[PDB]
């Protein structure tokens, strides 16, 4: 198998501060993304494609797709009073072997990432090129 | 050739409980995506990932990716009184041959699946790792 | 080294009429995006997928991704008055030798295309298939 992963989140409002724990998989070789803490650890050497969709309800939303302790994309949304509404985001990434990759949310001011039963956010990832 | 297509949808609120037909190719290598059913039916077996980006104007809308029969991933956004909007999705999906990708509107409760000339809509997919 | 990409914007409302110049690169495999232009120019003749994410704030915004003096796909969104908001776009394309693929908003009269030091509108692209 090749890594490659996505997954969804079905509660709204998961902690701040901490990897977000897309729980519902829809695919996961080589069982690199870890469902009970949120995080990819890259097994295999080489560029990947990460992606994330994440909703925002109630207050504005603030999130960073890490790599290891360092923010590697930011994506901001403000809550649309009354609304639903929803921010993505993407990125092409070199890892190295024990690299750690997820998405969090940095600031308590801003947690309003929403998610529903029907009402997916979502974090997917999957190898391009091994180096 | 490998399966890939990018098809985009220029005229606005397709029919509920049926694939959503993008009609407009960029590309359809393979030609496994129809513009005449909304479907991508997978000929080459492998790992796969397909993203979407769907407006909404007019009225609510929900939408969800399928594989056959079910419903893998749920995309939902809300009218913005008189605004235009956006929501997204990815996801990575291992197929086998003859399995259908595509997306659709559950409930006409939530069809404002908005797009134009100017404004599309869209469905793209490709084939990652052949299995 | 294959050919692959994520360029982020951190400063708002780059100019209409020219390539969006995402200038913070995560990753920028055999150099063939150019921070200095906005520009990525095929050196390895094949499939491609690109993406991106643009920020709205202050005023709508209409985009396009161009492909030499063509524009092969186009997002739009009405900017949602006081609200920071986004819209996104992915789209595969077969590309030849020299061929140019950028992001440029071609009306005055929607270019509120924003981005921060805490938000990054982006533009990524990578090779699928060689040709
Ligand atoms: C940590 C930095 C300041 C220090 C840093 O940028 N130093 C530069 C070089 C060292 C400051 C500068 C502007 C701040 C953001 C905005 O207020 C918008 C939004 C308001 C929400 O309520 C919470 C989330 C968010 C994204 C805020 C986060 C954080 O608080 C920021 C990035």
Redesign the pocket.
Known sequence: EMPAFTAELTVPFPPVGAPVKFDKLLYNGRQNYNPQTGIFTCEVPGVYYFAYHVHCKGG?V?VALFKNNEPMM?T?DEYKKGFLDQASGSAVLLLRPGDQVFLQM??E??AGLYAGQYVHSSFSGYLLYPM
């Open positions: 504005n603030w930011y901001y940095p600031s001011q801003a």
